[PDB]
Structures are given as structure tokens and as C-alpha cells.
Design a protein around this ligand. Structure first.
Ligand code: NA
Length: 240
């Protein structure tokens, strides 16, 4: 349904709410949890960046946003999680989405730690396909129809046909609305189709690591090397 907030996983919303309810809550402890959730991460960043309107460099990590807007503000984002009624889109594999998203973020953080700010690349990774969550949330029944029929490139075309947008473009407009740095958005768009170029490549790697962790290939072995990584980094990235 339109104007419905992106949802958070149940257990995770429970943790975040309880944590925040305490008066002895820390920013580090709140950030650790929040940053595993695309929805909350997106609301906070929009909250921290939108007011600025471009008057300064944007935050691109939760911890950075917490310290900017203050911990009492962020408690409140936690305190209302309850309201967001782990979603009605029947065909959408929410758990898979949440796992893949987190693994991609962890991977991309590792990758850039040895090659752009890791904490921020973590965030881009996490949110790199948030347009899927948004479709499932705005139009559950319609999106189910789509997911049940198509997949991959057909899916994008079917989404375009049914919603006058796709999940890749949604991701990008959301990230732009949330004040993400232009370079991240370009990198993402680039990666959505085989400097900005380097990062786009690390993102696709991260996505690929993610794909495989939720399931050592030839090309992926070479992708590792295109990024200047090589081993055993690539292995470490596939083992917890
Ligand atoms: Na409801």
C-alpha cells in the first residue's frame, strides 16, 4: 500500500525497540543493529540528509547519522517500529532479501577496506537493491503477480510494464531521496550493467560473493583479481 513504510524483520525490530527503550542505550549498540536493516537505515539517512538540502556533505553510514542527529532522535525511530504492521507481498522472499542484503554489505565493506570509505560502502551494499523491498511494500499483490511469472531481465521489463518503473531505478531514486553521495549512485547504476568504475566493480563482486554465500567459481575468481584483491581475501570473504 502506498505511503506504507519499508518493513523491518520481526526479531530485529524487537531488539532495536527494546534496546532503545532503555535509558542506558549507546549509539554504538544502536548503530550495530540498525545498520543491518535497509528500512531503518533509509529512514535515518533521509532524516539526517534531507534537512541539509545539500548545504554540506551527506552522512552515508548509520553511526555517522546517529552522532549528527543525536541519539534521542534515533531512539524515536526505534520507538515507532511497532506501527509498521515480514510483509504482505506473498511471493517476495523477505528473509532471502534480508540475508543477501546484509552479506552484500559486509562483503563490499571488506572489499573497499583494501581499495572509498568502508563504513559507507557497507551502506551502499546493504541498500543496493532496496527498490525490490519498496515494490513489495507499495504493491504486494501486483508484485506477487510479477515475481510469480518473471525473473531477472524479464522481471525488470515486467515491473516496467506493471509499475512504470523497475527495482534498479527505484533503488536509485530512493538513494537520491535519502541524500546518498552522487558517486555511489553512479557506481550502482554502472554495476547494474556490465573512480566510479572501480567501485561499481567491487559492488558487483560483493553481490556475487553474496549470491554464493547464500547457496570458487572461474570468472568470480578473475573478478576478484580485476579489483586487485586476489587471494586468500576471496576465500576469507566466503567463510563466515
Ligand atoms: Na495493517
Amino acid at each position: 500500500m502506498l505511503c506504507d513504510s519499508l518493513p523491518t524483520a520481526s526479531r530485529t525490530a524487537a531488539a532495536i525497540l527494546n534496546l532503545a527503550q532503555s535509558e542506558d542505550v549507546t549509539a554504538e549498540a544502536l548503530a550495530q543493529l540498525i545498520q543491518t536493516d535497509p528500512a531503518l537505515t533509509g529512514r535515518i539517512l533521509r532524516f539526517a540528509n534531507a534537512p541539509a538540502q545539500g548545504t554540506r556533505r551527506p552522512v552515508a553510514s548509520v553511526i555517522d547519522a546517529i552522532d549528527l542527529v543525536g541519539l534521542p532522535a534515533v531512539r524515536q525511530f526505534a520507538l515507532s517500529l511497532s506501527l509498521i504492521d515480514e510483509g504482505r507481498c506473498e511471493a517476495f522472499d523477505y528473509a532471502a532479501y534480508w540475508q543477501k542484503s546484509l552479506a552484500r554489505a559486509v562483503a563490499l565493506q571488506s572489499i573497499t577496506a583494501q581499495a572509498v570509505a568502508p563504513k559507507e560502502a557497507f551502506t551502499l551494499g546493504l541498500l543496493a537493491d532496496v527498490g525490490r523491498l519498496a515494490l513489495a511494500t507499495a504493491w504486494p499483490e501486483e508484485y506477487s503477480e510479477c515475481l510469480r511469472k518473471a525473473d531477472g531481465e524479464a522481471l525488470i521489463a515486467l515491473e516496467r510494464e506493471r509499475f512504470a518503473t523497475d527495482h534498479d531505478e527505484l533503488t536509485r531514486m530512493l538513494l537520491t531521496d535519502w541524500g546518498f553521495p552522487q558517486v555511489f549512485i553512479d557506481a550502482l547504476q554502472l554495476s547494474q550493467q556490465d573512480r566510479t568504475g572501480r567501485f561499481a566493480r567491487q559492488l558487483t563482486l560483493a553481490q556475487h560473493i553474496a549470491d554464493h554465500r547464500l547457496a570458487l567459481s572461474p570468472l568470480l575468481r578473475a573478478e576478484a583479481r580485476r579489483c586487485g584483491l586476489g587471494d586468500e581475501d576471496l576465500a576469507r570473504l566466503l567463510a563466515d
